[PDB]
Design a protein around this ligand. Structure first.
Ligand code: ZN
Length: 328
């Protein structure tokens, strides 16, 4: 008899600051079993799992007491809103929220499910938090989302940007299938960086145009993993398609389409939601697993035709990243 209930708690980190769910940001969607006054960091669309610094688990939801409808309860094991670690207030609060934003931006804004099953039923977003010991990564493994708590260089890696990034690697294999190498691998990596921006936009109405600044320790020298307005700021990512060479790792050939996306959403009468709508649809209906950068421009133009967007805004942008769409 687990029923809807409203979770109140804190999030953030020492760098971007600490904020309260139910004041600064929406209440969390939890479930509650009254007869035991136990609560669960789980709703229809998102399960948050507390790995407790282990490396394997059974993905039973994080479970916290909620003893004593506009009633709300405080999250965390000591029912005070906290699950503090390595400078973060409660990375598990931040996953539940991240899982929400991503599930909603995809379903409400684009009408599609971020995650679906083989047979087409939607697939519940499992967020595995506190994974490992001082783990400085977050990754997608086909079935679920794993976030490390970081170490000396980064705070725990639960944030809308990181979460949207890694989750949307699920969106790409169940749709376009953009292979994780070559040009398509850059496009894959790129799509996740766009989804990272779209999650920050759903949330607060503006976005970083960077990747990971919120998780980088403020005394770690680095301030951001990638810049999408000018990728080559990072020293190695490329800005235009003509700079490609087959030996780019995907996190550095991602600069092309990341630049493209920044250029498109900054066009007159464009916003982020419009530009990502094109990409979600191109990923959904036209992009091929072996896609070249030029084939991706065709997929975008074909998608915009399906949604009615302005094709000449698309082309100027493609043209600025030295992609040519002549043969589509
Ligand atoms: Zn990635």
């Amino acid at each position: 008899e687990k029923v809807q209930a409203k979770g109140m708690g804190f999030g953030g980190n020492r760098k971007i600051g600490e904020y309260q769910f139910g004041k600064d940001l929406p209440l969390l969607e939890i479930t509650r079993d009254s007869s035991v006054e136990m609560c669960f960091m789980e709703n229809t669309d998102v399960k948050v799992v507390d790995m407790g610094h282990k490396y394997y688990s059974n993905n039973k939801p994080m479970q916290f007491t909620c003893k004593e409808s506009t009633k709300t309860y405080y999250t965390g094991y000591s029912a005070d809103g906290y699950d503090r670690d390595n400078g973060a207030a409660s990375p598990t609060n931040d996953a539940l929220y991240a899982g929400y934003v991503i599930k909603h931006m995809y379903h409400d804004w684009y009408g599609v499910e971020a995650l679906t099953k083989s047979d087409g039923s939607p697939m519940q977003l499992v967020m595995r938090v506190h994974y490992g010991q001082g783990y400085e990564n977050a990754y997608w493994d086909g079935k679920q989302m794993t976030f490390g708590d970081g170490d000396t260089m980064m705070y725990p890696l639960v944030s809308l940007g990181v979460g949207g990034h890694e989750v949307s690697h699920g969106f790409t294999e169940q749709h376009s299938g953009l292979e994780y190498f070559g040009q398509s691998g850059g496009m894959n990596e790129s799509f996740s960086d766009m989804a990272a921006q779209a999650a920050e936009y759903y949330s607060v109405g503006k976005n970083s145009w960077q990747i990971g600044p919120e998780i980088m320790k403020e005394d770690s020298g680095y301030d951001a993993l990638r810049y999408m307005d000018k990728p080559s700021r990072d020293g190695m990512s490329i800005d235009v398609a003509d700079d490609y060479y087959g030996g780019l790792d995907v996190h550095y050939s991602s600069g092309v389409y990341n630049h493209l996306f920044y250029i498109l959403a900054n066009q007159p009468n464009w916003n982020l939601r419009m530009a990502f709508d094109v990409m979600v649809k191109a990923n959904m209906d036209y992009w091929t697993p072996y896609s070249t950068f030029d084939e991706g421009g065709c997929g975008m133009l074909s998608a915009a035709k399906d949604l009615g967007y302005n094709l000449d805004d698309i082309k100027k942008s493609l043209s600025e990243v030295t992609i040519n769409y002549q043969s589509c």
